[PDB]
Amino acid sequence: NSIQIGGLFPRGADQEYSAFRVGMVQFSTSEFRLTPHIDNLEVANSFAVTNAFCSQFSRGVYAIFGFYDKKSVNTITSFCGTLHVSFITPSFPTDGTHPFVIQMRPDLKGALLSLIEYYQWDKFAYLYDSDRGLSTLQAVLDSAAEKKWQVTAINVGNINNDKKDETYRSLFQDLELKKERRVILDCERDKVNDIVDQVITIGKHVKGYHYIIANLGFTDGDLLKIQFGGAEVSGFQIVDYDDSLVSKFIERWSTLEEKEYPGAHTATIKYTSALTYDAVQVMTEAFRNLRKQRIEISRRGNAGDCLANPAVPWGQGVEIERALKQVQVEGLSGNIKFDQNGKRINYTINIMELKTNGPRKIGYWSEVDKMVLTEDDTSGLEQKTVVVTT
């Protein structure tokens, strides 16, 4: 009972596809075995996106998978909403309650504001790429109004890579105009590491600065590069490497040859790939439940062209969405549960700090329990030599 499915992996995301293969291995079952229609197209090109989408639509696949640009979010959302076709992504969440949308990323927002409340900050810079969306910006400004915060947001992401060096010099000087000591970062990890390297060259990795990496994968960055600069650094993490399930996953992970599985032969992993494997588990078990439902849904390429006027979607997939939302199962990021709005719910996000020995947890963050500090202090390392000015 092999089940046709979509496959929209952006170029250069090899580790993700490899993780997808591992997901295909870990949950293969006799009741059914998935039938990917894997493609490698630019995520930015909404036209090509529509092309492959309508192609798989011609295949009439009962499910679709892939990422999306903020430029392309409206695309896939408009298609899932119009065609009543279920879809799953590990991309950043929509700001609206869009039907037929599944998403592996719990919002990092509330934990972030909670973190800010924990540090009881009042003034800070907020660097950001445009790409993940400005929702976090709208949020931090929103809290800034009530909390009398003095935001200094800046769009770093439009800067050309050709001279991704010159701008930074004036940029941090701009911070020096107010002597900001507190700078939230909101970019993808590559831009992150680059900018951190610039912080090294300008020497602002020195102690008394504080930093926040707004991403699910706090460990993914090259933190070792500035571990000893003395400036405090901390960030959120959705993936506990210490988990035994995760541990075994690593045990099968690094051991594999990177040739057959690029990006897999490492001690580390992108949170995205973990979201991928988790998505595989969720979808697979979902259809496993469909078999219990015994609600036959099989159809040919009845869907035909996507430009049917009006197009009239088949409603069995609408039921499939309901089957998806009700799924509640453990994954690499701990438990996975969905609201009927399709957002992940009742999840948890571990807090992380960069101790001098290395990165370290100090607590976890439920959406309902808000911030939750853990006692894990290891009975205190040292007082780190108190400064005494005079």
Ligand X SMILES: CC(=O)N[C@@H]1[C@@H](O)[C@H](O)[C@@H](CO)O[C@H]1O
Positions in the binding site for a copy of itself (CB under 8 A): 45-48, 50-51, 54, 71-72, 74-75, 78-79, 81-83, 134, 138, 141-142, 144-146, 148, 150, 152-155, 169, 174, 177-178, 200-203, 205-206, 225, 228-230, 307, 309
From 5, 154, 120, 151, select the one nearest 66 (Cα to Cα): 5
Q: Are the C-beta atoms of residues 218 and 237 closer than 8 Å to each other? A: yes
CB of 253 to a copy of itself, least distance (A): 29
CB neighbour class for 158 (10 Å; exposed up to 12, middle 13-18, buried from 19)? exposed
Q: Mask 116-135, x = binds ligand X (CB under 6 A)?
A: --------------------
What residues numbered 302-341 form the site for ligand X, per CB under 6 A?
A: 328, 334-335, 337
- Closest to a copy of itself by CB, 51 vs 326, is 51
Q: Identify whether the C-beta of residue 270 lies closer than 8 Å to the C-beta of residue 315.
A: no
Give the x/- contact pattern for ligand X in 341-360, rule: CB under 6 A.
-----x--------------
Specify the residue, 153 or 282, whose C-beta has the smaller distance to a copy of itself: 153
Q: What is d(CA 141, CA 126) in angstroms, rounded to the nearest whole number? A: 10
Residue 78 touches which member of a copy of itself, ligand X, none, C-beta under 5-8 Å by kind: a copy of itself
Q: How far is the CB of 66 from a copy of itself (least distance, A)?
A: 16
Which does residue 328 bind out of a copy of itself, ligand X, none, counting CB within 5 to 8 angstroms by kind?
ligand X
Spatial CA neighbour of 43 closest among 77, 67, 12: 67
**Which of 94, 16, 15, 316 is closest to 7 using CA atoms?**
16
**Nearest distance, CB of residue 335 and ligand X, angstroms:** 4
Looking at beta carbons only, is 75 or 346 nearer to ligand X?
Answer: 346
Answer for the pair 264, 10: CB distance below 8 angstroms, yes or no: no
Task: Name the binder of 356 from a copy of itself, ligand X, none, CB < 5-8 A by kind.
Answer: none
Nearer to ligand X by C-beta: 227 or 346? 346
- Nearest distance from residue 333's CB to ligand X, in Å? 11
Residue 208 partner contact from ligand X, a copy of itself, none using kind-dependent CB cut-offs of 5 to 8 Å: none
Q: Which residues pair with 237 in a beta bridge?
A: 217, 350
Give 13 or 279: the residue with its C-beta nearer to ligand X: 279
Alpha carbons 390 and 372: distance in angstroms, whole number: 39
Q: Which is nearer to ligand X, 224 or 245 (CB)?
A: 245
Q: How far is the CB of 318 from a copy of itself (least distance, A)?
A: 17
Q: Which residues contact 389 (CB under 8 A, 6 or more apart)?
A: none
Residue 309 binding result from a copy of itself, ligand X, none, given CB thresholds of 5 to 8 Å by partner type: a copy of itself
DSSP β-bridge partners for residue 360: 353
Nearer to a copy of itself, 51 or 289 (CB): 51
Q: In whole angstroms, give the CA distance from residue 237 to residue 267.
A: 16
Lookup: tokens for 36: 């990917």
How far is Cα 321 from Cα 87, in angstroms, rounded to an integer?
Answer: 9
- Kindly state the smallest distance separating residue 192's Cβ from a copy of itself, in Å: 18
The partner in contact with residue 87, picked from ligand X, a copy of itself, none with C-beta cut-offs of 5 to 8 angstroms by kind, is none
Q: Are 121 and 149 in contact (CB under 8 A)?
A: yes
- CB-side neighbour CA atoms (13 Å) of 76: 32
Q: Please give the distance of CA 380 from its chain centroid, rounded to a whole number.
A: 33
How far, rounded to the nearest angstrom, does the alpha carbon of residue 137 sit from its chain's CA centroid? 17
> Whole-number minimum distance, CB 345 to ligand X, in Å?
7
Residues that bind ligand X (CB under 6 A): 328, 334-335, 337, 346
